Amino acid sequence: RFHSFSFYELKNVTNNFDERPISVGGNKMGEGGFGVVYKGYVNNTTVAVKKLAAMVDITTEELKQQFDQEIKVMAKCQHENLVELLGFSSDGDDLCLVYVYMPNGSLLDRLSCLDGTPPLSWHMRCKIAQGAANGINFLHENHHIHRNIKSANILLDEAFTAKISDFGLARASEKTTAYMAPEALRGEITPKSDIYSFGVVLLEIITGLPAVDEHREPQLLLDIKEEIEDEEKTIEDYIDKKMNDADSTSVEAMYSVASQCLHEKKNKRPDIKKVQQLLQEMTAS
Template sequence: MQALPGSMDSVAMTSELRFLPPWARSQLAHILEVTHGWREVMGRVPSSPWQPGSPIPQDLHYPKKYSSDDIHLISEECVRDRREGFEVLLEEWGTSGRQRPTVQDLLELLRLAKLYRAMDYLTINVLHGEALPRQDGDPIEDLDKALQEGLRTYDNFIQEMGASGEVQDIPSSYTIDEPSSDDLALTIAPVIDDKTKVIGTCNNLTPGQSQAESPPLDTEVLQDLQSSGFTHFSYSLLKEITNNFSNVPTDLGGCKLGEGAFGVVYLAKIFQGGHEKKVAVKRLNSGEIKVEGQFKTEIEVLSRCIHENLLPLEGFSCDGPDWCLVYAYMPNGSLQDRLACSGGSEPLDWQIRVRIGEGAARGIVHLHTYQERPLVHRDIKSANILLDGSFIPKVGDFGLVHLGGSGTHTRTLIKTTTVFGTSAYMAPEAFRGDISVKMDTFSFGIVLLELLTGLPSYDEEREGCDLLSHVQESEAEVEELLDTQAGTWDMNIASHLFALVGLCTEAKKKRPTMVQALYNYSQIINKQLD
């Protein structure tokens, strides 16, 4: 297998769909959006007893995983959120079941649906293989020509879309004389010769004055950036201090800290206030059409929602070919890596784990309660809980945060068929499209279970692949489930925390809010419960 461009990973026919790199997912989504081919794929996905890796049934009457109503609802949601249907399909189908669908399963569905352009892209550009044979009698040249023209039209349309979802004329630049609160120009730090420094004085740089071609920023984003108070870092600076966005991992002498659905994160050093400071630079995937939403959401949330247990944003960059977000660097990495003792790190003792759980809960509660309209994180997991030098947890990755309606913190905030987050952490109702603050409660319960057991949230090799099923199906006592690497647990605290996990992962109606869960947590660790 050959390495993917810009990635340390590789893709094979047997690779799970959820591991397709973002650039491949994005291009496939573009191709399948032109003729709504993703609907054809979704409508052909088999249901049980079919298992991933088995031949796709060709009988038209075999059980289907998704109904026509499911496809219609997702289509409506994609229109509202300006998303592409194939992305949503991958998020749902690609993470469902104990045995996950593979690239080979997708290829077979594309072949049966005669979606040859997507099939060729997957086999040639992603798998680096030869084009698969077509079915006899298909007018391939005319179909490919039509799809190519349609894709160009679609890409142009996306570039012209404004925040309202209507086609707008986007000016090449904004001209101003003096900056004011009404200006659409972006107030940022100018580029200077000494690219190892960040300065505080500001000039005005508009999209038309950028160093390189950038994705179009809508007016709302520009206004938010202008008032955010965050530092702007030039793209050339970030490129230099990350060694040209080196994809060599930090433990091998490079700059890459990690990679997620929205982009790659790099370690860098800057000089600010006369002192050297480490930062984490997230370069967003420019191929993703939802990148503007990610960029805007992170800045909106972190400019208004400041808390000791939320990851602080240092600044941003939008004057280059890729947008970037710059965060404070967390030297102890993610909770997921520390529980796995990645890089040979020492196991976390149980007292530190208990404090991490409480801090993470406080950060989530702040998201839910700091304003009248609560924010739902929707992607709480150990990989998104970062640890500073003192192991104080910082909840991060706010790109999926949903701003809810006004009202109580227990109400359902949104009904949607779009499923986000990581499957093992997701509440059952989320798969039905019901997103509320209690979704974060369920996810927190899984994180707490990781802290107690030291086990990963998902493991294909064990009985009960997801952690909650594994524990629920186990006949072991609490003492046997606890991670012995954490030292000698206080059994009273551990038993009550296991009980809290049970509450947090109950059915939605019985599940507490995070406010209630945090109150119970504090009572437990302060030994105020018998």
């Protein structure tokens, strides 16, 4: 079902790539590593369109095949916890990617309760963290590295199933430091870097706090692990007060996983399968 789109159909579907925000009449959902992301409706499906690069800038045939083979891998990585890539476009001015629109947005927006949405229950946050780990495991099982794990790249479908997004885009970008591992900051590429970033997301899930805040002590959310180990604060102090069903036992279970993930030595962190085990045992009975 993965196919190509005419750049001029995507133009119509996005109201001529209306860069205005949706709230004022446009189609802009946001912007990240590859500029504006546009919302549209095509083939009886609400979609998210992402403009990678310009077709003129893809000059050499090596750059053409560097993106063709890169998109082949993305289109093949289909899983319950991965955003489905519907297609692409190359016949026009810009190289585009068409993803399935996730109606509940990103985990980042729901943790901050953007647009008046209700806060996620602790029961849902556990199922979301488990699904995200299942999606990361699918990538690692097939020898892939996401390289850009963060709450903004964990989307939620109609049933609040976790859908990892933007896989391979960081790979194509090299062809947001608050989530990156120490070895990732130094340029090292390893699936153990994803485990570290997933640990930061778990802290966001527990606290409902963003990974970085300029007017906050500490500024980086990953630094609160030092406050817990030094007995300056407890995990109970940081628990999202907007939850109504949190229990200290399972919360400390998820924090124990987040702690192991945030080991500075990449060999001390568990693999994604151990993360799956601990997250599944967290809700066992």
